[PDB]
Design a protein around this ligand. Structure first.
Ligand SMILES: CCCCCCCCCCCCCCCCCC(=O)O
Ligand code: NA
Length: 122
């Protein structure tokens, strides 16, 4: 669920998920518009697409099992929805960590007027 995704983000990046990954670029936030502005933004875009594939699941409310061992997130046993949601969340959290080097404070609260057409497609 979103509480768990938030904890993953904090564990992987050392940043609180709000505001650092809720108001960044064009896609780190609710949905998005336009094209991803950098690597971190593309992680958010991919995560949105990942959730999009889970048509029969409720990714923001379904709580799943996971652990984090030798610095690796391990999605635990569960329903197919729980497992797939966990894997979407893990991938995005790791993606954020891997692109912290290019995280730009400039892109927090990125003006929605610059998230211009054409939209990137999943
Ligand atoms: C007045 C309201 C203040 C704002 C609300 C504060 C509470 C926010 C709780 C955050 C929990 C985890 C949020 C997960 C964010 C996911 C980001 C993303 O889509 O990449
Ligand atoms: Na988004």
């Amino acid at each position: 669920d979103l509480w768990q995704f938030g904890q993953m983000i904090l564990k992987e990046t050392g940043k609180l998920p709000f505001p650092y990954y809720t108001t960044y670029g064009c896609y780190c936030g609710w949905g998005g518009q336009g094209q991803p502005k950098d690597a971190t933004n593309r992680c958010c875009f991919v995560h949105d697409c990942c959730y999009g594939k889970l048509t029969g699941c409720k990714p923001k409310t379904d709580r799943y099992s996971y652990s984090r061992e030798n610095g690796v997130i391990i999605c635990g046993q569960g329903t197919p929805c729980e497992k797939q949601i966990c894997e979407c969340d893990k991938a995005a959290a790791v993606c954020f960590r891997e692109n912290l080097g290019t995280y730009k404070k400039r892109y927090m609260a990125y003006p929605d007027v610059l998230c211009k057409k054409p939209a990137e497609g999943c």
